[PDB]
Scaffold this active site. Structure first.
Site, PDB file in Angstrom:
ATOM      1  N   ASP A 139     -12.060   8.321  -8.486  1.00  0.00           N
ATOM      2  CA  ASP A 139     -13.392   8.815  -8.045  1.00  0.00           C
ATOM      3  C   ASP A 139     -13.203  10.180  -7.360  1.00  0.00           C
ATOM      4  O   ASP A 139     -14.220  10.804  -7.014  1.00  0.00           O
ATOM      5  CB  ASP A 139     -14.122   7.782  -7.183  1.00  0.00           C
ATOM      6  CG  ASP A 139     -13.599   7.568  -5.775  1.00  0.00           C
ATOM      7  OD1 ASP A 139     -12.554   8.136  -5.427  1.00  0.00           O
ATOM      8  OD2 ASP A 139     -14.262   6.844  -5.024  1.00  0.00           O
TER       9      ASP A 139
ATOM     10  N   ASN B  21      -8.991   5.296   2.760  1.00  0.00           N
ATOM     11  CA  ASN B  21      -9.680   6.029   1.672  1.00  0.00           C
ATOM     12  C   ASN B  21     -10.610   7.063   2.319  1.00  0.00           C
ATOM     13  O   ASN B  21     -11.356   6.705   3.260  1.00  0.00           O
ATOM     14  CB  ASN B  21     -10.408   5.032   0.764  1.00  0.00           C
ATOM     15  CG  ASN B  21     -10.908   5.625  -0.539  1.00  0.00           C
ATOM     16  OD1 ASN B  21     -10.766   6.819  -0.781  1.00  0.00           O
ATOM     17  ND2 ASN B  21     -11.485   4.800  -1.409  1.00  0.00           N
TER      18      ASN B  21
ATOM     19  N   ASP C 296      -6.324   8.110  -0.786  1.00  0.00           N
ATOM     20  CA  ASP C 296      -5.832   7.090   0.166  1.00  0.00           C
ATOM     21  C   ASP C 296      -4.632   7.680   0.934  1.00  0.00           C
ATOM     22  O   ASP C 296      -3.718   8.253   0.259  1.00  0.00           O
ATOM     23  CB  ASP C 296      -5.362   5.860  -0.615  1.00  0.00           C
ATOM     24  CG  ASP C 296      -6.476   5.039  -1.245  1.00  0.00           C
ATOM     25  OD1 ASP C 296      -7.654   5.302  -0.966  1.00  0.00           O
ATOM     26  OD2 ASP C 296      -6.141   4.103  -1.964  1.00  0.00           O
TER      27      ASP C 296
ATOM     28  N   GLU D 296       0.869  -1.202   0.000  1.00  0.00           N
ATOM     29  CA  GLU D 296       0.000   0.000   0.000  1.00  0.00           C
ATOM     30  C   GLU D 296       0.894   1.236   0.000  1.00  0.00           C
ATOM     31  O   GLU D 296       0.603   2.128  -0.796  1.00  0.00           O
ATOM     32  CB  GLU D 296      -0.948  -0.029   1.196  1.00  0.00           C
ATOM     33  CG  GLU D 296      -2.051  -1.086   1.063  1.00  0.00           C
ATOM     34  CD  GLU D 296      -3.083  -0.825  -0.026  1.00  0.00           C
ATOM     35  OE1 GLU D 296      -2.930   0.168  -0.751  1.00  0.00           O
ATOM     36  OE2 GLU D 296      -3.982  -1.662  -0.197  1.00  0.00           O
TER      37      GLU D 296
END
Ligand code: NA
Length: 129
Positions: free
Chosen positions: A48, A59, A52, A35
């Site tokens: 969108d 998120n 993050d 990540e």
């Protein structure tokens, strides 16, 4: 802060992530590696327009407030900036709510694609825990 592998493993364990919701420590270290590369200051914009934040790339769409994600929630009741701290308390507290939400660690698509079903124990190999 860029954590070392065993350093992050130890910090996650102290904060009670080891076997949280049945997920061994190596799952959480694996997720963090892919990540954030263990960088607390990691930020990535989603298509969108959500973002993050932090070692576990939490998120703004559901979990934290960044003020720029229309129609989003703040279910962890924190500003997203708190997820960039060198202290992982806020990231770990929020990750416990995410992994409790019904889909376990599949909420982290990089966990599902890169950690799930692999030898995750390797991530805590050699660590003094
Ligand atoms: Na939000």
């Amino acid at each position: 802060k860029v954590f070392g592998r065993c350093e992050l493993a130890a910090a996650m364990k102290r904060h009670g992530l080891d076997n949280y919701r049945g997920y061994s420590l190596g799952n959480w270290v694996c997720a963090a590696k892919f990540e954030s590369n263990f960088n607390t200051q990691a930020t990535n914009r989603n298509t969108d327009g959500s973002t993050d934040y932090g070692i576990l790339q939490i998120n703004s769409r559901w979990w934290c407030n960044d003020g720029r994600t229309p129609g989003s929630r703040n279910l962890c009741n924190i500003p997203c900036s708190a997820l960039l701290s060198s202290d992982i308390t806020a990231s770990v507290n929020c990750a416990k709510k995410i992994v409790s939400d019904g889909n376990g660690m599949n909420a982290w698509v990089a966990w599902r694609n890169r950690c799930k079903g692999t030898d995750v124990q390797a991530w805590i190999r050699g660590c003094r825990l």
